[model samples]
Target: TLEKFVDALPIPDTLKPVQQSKEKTYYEVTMEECTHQLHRDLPPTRLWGYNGLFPGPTIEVKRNENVYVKWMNNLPSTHFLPIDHTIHHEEPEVKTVVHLHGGVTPDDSEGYPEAWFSKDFEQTGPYFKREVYHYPNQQRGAILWYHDHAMALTRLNVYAGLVGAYIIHDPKEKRLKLPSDEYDVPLLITDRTINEDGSLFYPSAPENPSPSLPNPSIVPAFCGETILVNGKVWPYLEVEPRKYRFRVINASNTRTYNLSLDNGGDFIQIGSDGGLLPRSVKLNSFSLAPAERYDIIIDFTAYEGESIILANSAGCGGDVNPETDANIMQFRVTKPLAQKDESRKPKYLASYPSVQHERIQNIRTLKLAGTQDEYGRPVLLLNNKRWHDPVTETPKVGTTEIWSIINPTRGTHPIHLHLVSFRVLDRRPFDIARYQESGELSYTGPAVPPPPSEKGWKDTIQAHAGEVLRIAATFGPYSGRYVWHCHILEHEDYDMMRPMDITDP
Candidate 1:
């Protein structure tokens, strides 16, 4: 096993556009196989990275900016990770499509799962439309991210190291004078299991595979044995006695982290997945599921010379070990002040959620449930349908809707919708046994409003078992094709996602 907190944290360099003009910005990123040491003691491990860098270079853009990225693929044709042929079963094996999580983009640029392409664009999926993708950046500033979303291989490709941070900055938010430049950092949190030889260890099949099952069968869930921040395993960061803004993103395949400071310091949360909160919230800790982003500020002024730890309270398949998985990274407040701290932690951050007085055009009911495959392995489903099923979620352009997501499964699923953000209405417990047997909605508890931390806009939400979670959203600005699915990469790959169409009226 590798020792913890020995390596220094890596801050991904901001990407520079290849060509820039007043009208547009263009960038070219190539996907290549590369090697990098994940820990101080281990050898360089093989990974598929953007521009040959894990946690690829961070991209920053201004609101309302016109940006285009020609994401190219230059890696070997065959994939190194185990491929479950029983899944979507595509040709050439290694297909890729870049999805900008939390990007308020049009349908074409939303990176539909079927819009995949192979090496050198030699082969393209049926939905492939263009080589260059466009982003108008016409939404609020937030911490967005990018990752592979190919059919059936999303879990394997993302786990192999294909993720990065994309920040949309609003000049208006600058008036708040939040930390900028070096003081503002992006923390991309990923968990993995490594073999003794410095190779990644993704499961080829379940623990005890059925004798009749395929050689490489898909698993229902995955929990890494170790944690890494920005490509370094159990790393540490030294900060001066000042305030620092951190964009914390959970890019794990399935694990959910309830994070806290070991020294019991408070984390002032300033934003959520969609953007800034209406008011800053002082939180002892908060839950961050896969694909969730928590923008926070940590003041180290009073903790100089202290070696504090960012600890994790949640567990994987079992209880967390204090010496291993329980700890995320170390924060050393020993550096001398480079300059005066000028960032402000204002009480008021952004505008509140807009009140919707328009008539609700439609109400949709969705379900999170699971069934066993023919081989006895688990297969999670959304509304009991597969990915290729005819689209049932068709929303008209410029219309608002309320979606009641019912979770009958035993665990929580982080549901994500593309193209727009939504407001969490309320959640109420229901009689699961009765609902399953009789197909009736029976509430067992009163509806509870979302907490302060969740009162703002969100693109992803947690739907806990035996509860009905309601969220309201306006499908507007642009319309085409998109998707909604559980953020757990494992579940997403095994047919838990569905197509969503926003039709033009």
Candidate 2:
């Protein structure tokens, strides 16, 4: 029975700032469990969210400005999700740490995986720091996010809704007037499974799939059937008949979205994971991997009174039930054209980050290798190395290097780098048989440049199967230790991650 309707729908309120200044803006945030009405038909559900809202708040800032954050942990004594103890877990207590993904941060501000703390600053992890997290915001303007990064507990904490958006603005982008104010929206996309009495559904051994009626456990990369946008399960938005800007973020655990409108209309792709694309490209549909962001402008002037759905064709890894996860959200373009559409699309956007070909110091090869256990559950590795292994990815500060991510398998993976964003150099197909058996650079085809959508700076990218994905990046504005890993939480928690150090130049 729908005893209490949810006032309206559960659109998460924008996280307003607590204090503001020209130099350093201070913001305090916390984590807690709250009851949320995710679906109109279903009952209330319990979730762990930042502040009082699920999906957290939208944090806005200007380019080159400074921002400081003090994260507080105020959750229950226990966790509600599953934890794989075999995989380097430290605390059974509800420990949490926050990592601002894609930001060039100081060593102290960077959310170290082992820097976690439980309730009331009690029971902190080994590397825990109680100081404020400072953001230089020195890099190009882009969309970033903050989330829990506690060692071995990231998968569980983030799955409980510790995600939020962070937008860094620049005067360069401001010159080109796109959709501003209310017309511009952040679509934080995610998926989940529901229980009968309205609770978050997560599996224990979620990876090992049964061939028949089978089962679902919290293993591997999570692939849920029900998709949600901004905390609402299959919600709809009413928009005016004009050009509107939508910042689409693939915040899903493992699901990749082949996003397109039902009407087959093209949306202008103005920006990518790191920032604005050099030039805008039109696409009727495109695939977005997890942790990737797409800033697009969709025009609805021609489709009055039309209801179209933003859908995803690809589900999660392992081809797990994509058919049921097709549709993302509904867009009702029924409202009349509100005044004049002032937004404009330019052929040229911001400057794409350049690479110094001569400054290239060295080259590194990291393998996205996977291994299965006796129970058929697979755990991926970084260059076939364990987490505790000595770090081999130390690069001289300000030195640019090439990394060939050799994935000689049947599926693709999204590789994400922290503290730095790079451009995809190219990808070449190699022989899996020859490379895995022995060590050889046997190529089946010539190297091809990144697609138009990936031309700009990117922090996350889709590494296609059977290909050597090459990328180039400079080491640091701050010399310290950071990490680069597969964005898929399940793969990362297992071992598909490595530490990157920036040595003195």
Candidate 3:
């Protein structure tokens, strides 16, 4: 159901921060459902959001800066979404802890699964930190997001609209002279299904459309029929005929998008979730899984006086066709284009750490894919073990290790690791049918290097089916417990996630 198709509204908003200090910025974000006006075409919809804004306020910071966030839980007692009480879900309706998806923060502010708290700390999860949390932006600039990570209930919570963006800035990125401020946009793209009354639709069916065998008893991986960008449903934007920077983030519950333009234009990819790549790559389309970000610049110099659309070509899960899936937004070039365009793409982006690989200490292997439980309930597993089985991934503290993840499934698993950044080594494809039927894995092709978009340090990657995706990463500033899982949120919330036990070397 499209939103009657509206055109050109100025970008949602550039969230302004409360002035705390030059070195530290503070934010008191509220979690609640309020009246939201998605687009002019659709009527007002009821959805939860940060500070009552669907896309939420953007947190802008520089490298090495400190951000103290007071995450406030001020929602109604009832959750509009369905609750699967079978899992270890939060008892109350509104309990939340914020995981800074790609931020390198201390454990206190890391938003551990069980570290949630309710209004005024009346109730608290197991690993709860104080009401206030601190984020030490100690790495390069990247596009990271924040959301609720309460144990077993992440899928429901994020679907209820509790998400926001945190951008890291630094001298290295500033020197590139890319489009800034007005021309720079944060396209936080997401998909959802809604009722005729305009409320969000989830679960068993949509009058409805969850239609499947045995019904989805548990949380299921899904992609809605409607597309929203920065909180507008199939909305459009007007751009001057020039190069505009867009930080694209796929913040869906369970969906992957192969994003492209309707006019067949290529994007100059400059950065990813971790930051600037060594070089820029020209690409017409790229896949973005949940929690993944790609910063690209689209120069619309040729399409002056014409309209172009940022359309989606990816088949997003259920009830969506690549050809008919709603276009993300429309770009109409304004008349009387200015002649003083001065943005330059620098060849020298950033230097990788001089010390790598030589410092490697150990190597470990893990298996990723899924199967059904004994009772025939579909479940995604990691290493073929239950979540409570044991802490098997104990990496030595402050040392580098190589992780070889074997994927025998049919789809690519976008793997996400918490606390540390990694670089993909290569992907080796194998015979999945043979390997699954028998125990032996037979190689089908040679190991191939990662694509251009994978050159930078990353917190998430695509583990191709029938291939072993290898990654090299060093343990972080602290030694403790953390988790890794597929970025497919539905799978992750169901147990496709496992914790890493980081022990002192």
Candidate 4:
């Protein structure tokens, strides 16, 4: 039945690249209404899409090349997902803003939350514009993404499939001779729930469910069902007997993925959220939280006739149930290697800048609690304080700081920092209950080791429950306001997120 579902739908097609001059380019993106027939014999349900498709287009740019994107929103005023006005719902007349996640760009082009604008040039937000969002493309090669970040409606907008993959290429990476052309692919991994009629099921509290509401809040969001890759449910890809580079993004709202390959194929991880690592780390399985990215190389040349299943090994809280031992995608090796390939190897990767601990100037402690209030909504607090307080952590530009994220939540919290990459210092067990009751920390067990791939610079780090995760990072490149929050979309939308201002030195 699932295979029939896959067959009934059209194959996921790659976005066509428009060629401009070697210098400047113009790309058009339209946020239009679309329908997805998710269930068999069920009517199609309404949804929003970019260029009339979910999972938007795959945009590729070279390092130092300028890219201009024209985003056009053609959807009606009504939103398909639940909107919580008390938290951060976008007004029906309000436009949407697009932020390029993990991008290094000018503030004007940073897709400010207030820069939203509506269709047909009739309405606009406080910072609306007709011109395109300019990307200077100065950062190193890495996996970047574009998604709607309108205030209060980011979670719902993105859940309606307003996200896509962006890749920055460099000559240095080309010289390294990694997998390219048809061999390299971007896997945008996301999860969704389907109704009995095959339509997307977005969870929301009943209207007027809370009569005595103080601040606005949304229902706790979670998708416990099948996984989608490249817009296909339980899809499969044909592969040649050669090395392939997979740029993996954990785009799910709350799921964590401990990804691995069946048939004993190893993953040579070369990059994290920000960019490439100084060296490659061989791993059979690696963990990725929501909004986190990983660049890995896998060689299938050795197994010409065998098939491999791309599986999720993350524990119960991960993308798939570990108890079920389910498979996410399958790769069938249909052809043998044409020749002996020696271009891509683990030893020839680029080296990243060193993060010296002595360079750190300040050490701040951030505690994340998982307590809920009377309404049963998660009460996420940072440093024991809710959001909208006076700014708590502010760092001067070009300054390195040590952040200790203490997680008292029952599940893992993938802490993400904008504009900076950090190195994990350590993670030790903490007495969460004791700390919650007495405001004192006490440890009882051995320290959890940071994974090898985590040794490199990262823009996101996961802190398991009862663990104190330490990270070192330098804030700079551009001085202004940015955000650092839990990458779990549900937690972030409700109030677990906060903002920080980077002041000029």
Candidate 5:
């Protein structure tokens, strides 16, 4: 007999570290239901978490280090969010798995969908192991993320608040004399839907307001109203009157953030989704798509007397419909300044070997479109087909390829490629109707050059509506089928997602 699982799991208080032994460092991770408070008024309510927080604890390590994470599931058998069993539900059993997004690890630790397991050592999926996985920190230092990736349950499980930031540090970055220890902070930003009673409210129905539409299946991808940062809703932080390094992660379901300082301060972006760019780029404002990350240094020495708000200027992208205020968090610059502050200047931090673009092996174009079934369910369609189809993208090991992602949808979708890093070539708007009618692209506007931070290498790029984003990358290390999907978890789990393979040449 199948019994409904319901039990509250306490958040683990111990802080886990990734060791630096020559062999792989093994660490245990668990996903369970715990009570948390996003707002001050609310008492602790049940929510899924990693080690207990909404965004979980930050896991930090060094580059080229080997670390192993053992993810355990201690939640109840039943899911907290609405489950869609109709679409490729792997199993009826309660299962959990973790995917370290943007990590170039081995195929075994890649969190493949079929690799899941249940509680108490009772049942396991075909690819399930002993609840632990090895991570070879072979790539350069960067900010990655971990979240639940069980087939159809990905949307609900992540929405139930099971995500956290994973970072890799290198000694070369330390020698540069950048912000260290206390001065560096990880800011995990997300949005949530809350009830009047202060409990989390995940919509169980489709976002469309029409009541007469039949088969109104709840689409997995959508956004909530309230914005959250580091597990708190519109929280404020007290910062010192010095340069602080912020590793910002956009964990939002669907909304994109145009992050900037309300005081008009400049942001020195040193890194992108995969890792640090070749050099830091200065800008007053920048956009952050879902699952995208930016390592930036904000100097607060100039604004010592006043408070500044970290604002979001993401122009609604025509999908969010109604507009709202853009402010995300308020930072009070109260800490005293020192005479010899050396962390404010940009220094050469870390460097990777030059990318050998001439070793090219393949080139592929993925078309982002929409189907009749995906009309009301946010943006959908990849390569003119739904996600249920067999894998379409395949790359060979130790070879470079140029992937041209064509987005013909009405809204912009932040496209995130997994397992490897790529440099953005260019982005230009194309005619949607002509592309769909004649199967040929016609550009309407001038091409937009890649930003400085995006010029080196990236794992995620914002694909504007009717724009074509081209990226060049080399596939090696992990040779298996991995996923490339919209960073918006909702769109990913719904069907606007697909798998790609890196095969041995």
Candidate 6:
């Protein structure tokens, strides 16, 4: 029931550091309760933002640069969203912690879910450690992001607009000559359902709630009625008749997008979540799950003054409503050229993934099946284990291991592991009914290798139902405690995550 493309796209400004030294760069980010207009026709909506901006400021750093950010919380003590006390009955409900997604960080800086703090650091969780976080930026350049990772409250806080983009630039990749400066854009897409009075609306309970259920029960999944890019609902961007680079990120809670250019244009994918690909692949469309990043290049030189729409075919909760959820944004090639296009779209982007063929030290199998809670609400679990369970996924440092993720659930789950990037080996179907009944894993088809789009390094990956997805990774250069979980915020908050200890022994 809302208008489309009435608002122009908003590009977040690069964050400025508070202090800089040769050894490290120091930055400070504070969480605040703020309000701003989400659409041109509606009033400003209330939100919780980093630095008072909905999408937060884009933090940019160079490879090997030492960065430190003191993420502070200054919001009100009480939360504005619904809090299901049945989930976590702890006091001081409004807590915050910042997790840098895809960051190769140590345990203390990795933002453990339990290491959370409240307003002005008055109250902290069990695992609270240091105040400032350190990032070495040793990994390759990629589209990293920062968001809330507080235990039990992540879904609500993130839905309140606690997210932003972080980029690590490599000087070595500058030789590739891809689009630079204004031509390179980061498109952070989020789906939301807003109220007519311009307030955000998040469901407090599942549909047809039973009287026995909790007052505010947690739903398994959420699908918003509107799509937003960079905080604007169905916004549009003006581009010149030239090539442009876009770092597309899916920041939605549970919805996945099968994106394609409506005008039948091609998108040259040059990078995945981990970084640049070995070679560019021309793709007609791509499926983007939560927390997945696709760095692509699009050439509009042939379509001067034409309008193209970024469309989505994937549905949420149910079938996609064509008039509401189909379109993502618009790209209009009407801007005059500032200068002649000098960027090069080279097919050769970067080297292959790190650590190609090493001896597989060990292999472990995990499961994505769950049971219903006392209220008849589903509580998704990782390997049938709760978040408070003893840590079991312990990988030796500097060793490679293959993880076989078995998904017997009915929907796709974006499995994400912190501290390292991995290579997707393959996925094979299994007999779900047989596996569920007898705990037998029998392949129903051949193992299909990942497509060209997923050939590059990745940290977040989709494991579809009735399939066993395998990925290989080296524990890493640093050893400490980390976590692995489904990237769906609702699933993640409700015990779908587990502790992973990387031992040095």
For candidate 5, give the lDDT. Answer: 0.74
lDDT of 3 by residue, 1-505 (tens): 5643484443545566566787777778888778776667566788878887777778788898878888888878777777655444225666777789888877667888778877666788877868878888888888888888877778877877888788888866777898887778888887887777777888752233333424335555777777888887777677788888898988888778887887888898989888888788899999888888999999977888777777766665444464446477777776465556688766567765333544768888788756774445567889887666687888887888989889998787889988887887899988888878895778899999888788887898988788988999888877787878887877887778887877875
**C-alpha lDDT values of all predictions:** 0.92, 0.80, 0.78, 0.74, 0.74, 0.92
For candidate 1, the 10 contiguous residues with the lowest summed lDDT are: 84-93
How many angstroms is residue 64 displaced in model 6 relative to the true structure, after the best TM-score fit?
A: 0.5
> What are the runs in model 6 whose C-alpha is more than 4 Å off?
none
The backbone clash count of each candidate, in order, is: 0, 6, 1, 4, 2, 0
TM-score, candidate 6, is 0.99
Candidate 6 residue-wise lDDT, 322-345, digit = tens: 788999999999999999999989
TM-score of each: 0.99, 0.93, 0.93, 0.88, 0.90, 0.99
- Pitting candidate 2 against candidate 4, the one with the higher lDDT is 2
lDDT of 4 by residue, 1-505 (tens): 2442232212335455454687886688888989865433446756677887777878888898878887778888767665666664233544577888888766556665556766754566665554478887888899888888765666778777788888898877887888876677888887776676667777676335666544434765565476777666666677778898888888888778777888878999988888888788888888888899999998887877776878886653344553232556677788656565655866746664553535768998888865666665566767655556677788888888889888877788888887777777789997878988997889877766567687677887888888888888888778877778887777776677777777886
lDDT of 5 by residue, 467-499 (tens): 988888888776987878877766776677887
| Candidate 3 Cα misplacement greater than 4 A, ranges | 3-19, 205-216, 318-323, 335-339, 353-355
Error of 3 at 311 (Å): 2.0
For 368-424, candidate 1 gives per-residue lDDT tens digits of 987887788788889999898899999998898999999988889999999899999
| Candidate 4: stretches off by over 4 Å | 4-23, 36-45, 88-90, 93-95, 120-131, 206-217, 315-325, 335-342, 355-358, 370-374, 384-386, 445-449
Runs in model 5 deviating more than 4 A are 1-14, 17-22, 207-216, 315-325, 337-340, 347-355, 374-379
Report per-prediction Cα RMSD to one decimal. Answer: 0.9, 3.3, 2.7, 3.6, 5.5, 1.0
Candidate 3: worst-modelled 10 consecutive residues by lDDT = 205-214
